[PDB]
């Protein structure tokens, strides 16, 4: 139908992206060759949102794979689904960005970005009605972060009236010891506040605590983290990929979720939480899904929801279940907790049910919340940023690429202003 172009950038972006393609490919009965082999037509109705149709009855993901180094792309070419991507849609350089946003945004990323844009253009042109773009990347490295945000800025220039959507992985010192990640993240957030329409915040700190505390994994790997990411991505794009009423395209989603243009950062949530392989013998009940998906322990961003207020919430239930019961359980959650929901956006929780459950589950639920408690994540990045920046530590890696300190002070300011806008709405009354 209305086509979405997908771009994945950098190691993280390409790992989570690959993983998304595997998962939704299986949800739509498309196998590694591009051949459909399923038993429903719900699978094919809105396939064109994410797949182009090749002759021979083949489906090619509408996906562009970008990095400044070859590593993760030889690795994706030879993943399970690797042979599925169009080959001139792999765009890669040779030297890598060394976890430096300035290199990604200004010097090396600069070199490669016109080649990416040509592939994007080519994919656009062959779309009947393009809805827009979605990007997977982390904010704490150099390619996903600095190049990925350079891309967004260039795509916005050529396509100023399409929706831009990202899946932005937020860094945490529980997962990474690279010291400049708060610099890259703050510079990136600055770009995201200006140039995206929706951003899903996937917080490495949240994923790690989920894995450790709840899934009881003593030594989580990235693969463990990414398993939670891909469940989530599958969940949040359900409404775009199946027939339905609510949030069925990117623009309808943004009008339901974004009351003020800057506060477009979302907390996703998910139930049930599971670890790879290990087995799901008991289906959850509609009351369990409902309590779990609003649990703080099920949020992919480490924010405490009781610390803020929901401006808007979209909830998605999957698998065959009682719509009547979904309805009572949702009403029950809002009525029993009415004060976490801003009285000045009436009826701000929307609910969808899709009949097809995700692989290996009889049922799940995905939550997407625009909560003021997301300020906590920005505050954490800001505190890490300021501790270094007030002494100008590590700056020479950035100015050696031509950046000025001013650019840093601006990013910091824009982000401090974001945090206070969320605070203003947490306290607004009616």
């Amino acid at each position: 139908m209305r086509e979405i172009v997908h771009i994945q950038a950098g190691q993280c972006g390409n790992q989570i992206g690959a993983k998304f393609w595997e998962v939704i490919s299986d949800e739509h009965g498309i196998d590694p060759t591009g051949s459909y082999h399923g038993d429903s037509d719900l699978q094919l109705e809105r396939i064109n949102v994410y797949y182009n149709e090749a002759a021979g009855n083949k489906y090619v993901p509408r996906a562009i794979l970008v990095d400044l180094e070859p590593g993760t792309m030889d690795s994706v070419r030879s993943g399970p689904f690797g042979q599925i991507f169009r080959p001139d849609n792999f765009v890669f350089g040779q030297s890598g960005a060394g976890n430096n946003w300035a290199k990604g945004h200004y010097t090396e990323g600069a070199e490669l970005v016109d080649s990416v844009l040509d592939v994007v253009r080519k994919e656009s042109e062959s779309c009947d009605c393009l809805q827009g773009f979605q990007l997977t990347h982390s904010l704490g490295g150099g390619t996903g972060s600095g190049m990925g945000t350079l891309l967004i800025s260039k795509i916005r220039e050529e396509y100023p009236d399409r929706i831009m959507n990202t899946f932005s992985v937020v860094p945490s010192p529980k997962v990474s010891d690279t010291v400049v990640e708060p610099y890259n993240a703050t510079l990136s957030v600055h770009q995201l506040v200006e140039n995206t329409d929706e951003t899903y915040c996937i917080d490495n700190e949240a994923l790690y605590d989920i894995c450790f505390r709840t899934l009881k994994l003593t030594t989580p790997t990235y693969g463990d983290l990414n398993h939670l990411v891909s469940a989530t991505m599958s969940g949040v794009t359900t409404c775009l990929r199946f027939p339905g009423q609510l949030n069925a395209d990117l623009r309808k989603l943004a009008v339901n979720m974004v009351p003020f243009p800057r506060l477009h950062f979302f907390m996703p949530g998910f139930a049930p939480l599971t670890s790879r392989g290990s087995q799901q013998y008991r289906a959850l009940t509609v009351p369990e899904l409902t309590q779990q998906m609003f649990d703080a322990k099920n949020m992919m961003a480490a924010c405490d929801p009781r610390h803020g207020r929901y401006l808007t919430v979209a909830a998605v239930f999957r698998g065959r279940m009682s719509m009547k019961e979904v309805d009572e359980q949702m009403l029950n959650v809002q009525n029993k907790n009415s004060s976490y929901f801003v009285e000045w956006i009436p009826n701000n929780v929307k609910t969808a049910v899709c009949d097809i459950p995700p692989r290996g589950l009889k049922m799940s639920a995905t939550f997407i919340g625009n909560s003021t408690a997301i300020q906590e994540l920005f505050k954490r990045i800001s505190e890490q940023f300021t501790a270094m920046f007030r002494r100008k530590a590590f700056l020479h890696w950035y100015t050696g690429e031509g950046m000025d300190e001013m650019e840093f002070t601006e990013a910091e300011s824009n982000m401090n202003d974001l945090v206070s806008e969320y605070q203003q709405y947490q306290d607004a009354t009616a």
Binding site: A110, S153, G400
Partner: protein, 67 residues
């Protein structure tokens, strides 16, 4: 934004070029100044020694000037 991106890479290039230029300059002034100092220090050592030759002809002349 696109004009700014251009300035930044330009500034990078400029600062790198300037680092090289200054190093070339400082290297060449140090070399020629070291060359001069070393020449002087050897010129003076040799002329001191030349003055030993003048004085030794002067001592021998003075001898044969005694009758």
């Amino acid at each position: 934004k696109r004009e700014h991106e251009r300035e930044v890479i330009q500034k990078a290039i400029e600062e790198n070029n300037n680092f090289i230029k200054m190093a070339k300059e400082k290297l060449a002034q140090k070399m020629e100044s070291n060359k001069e100092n070393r020449e002087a220090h050897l010129a003076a050592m040799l002329e001191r020694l030349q003055e030993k030759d003048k004085h030794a002809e002067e001592v021998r002349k003075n001898k044969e000037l005694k009758e």
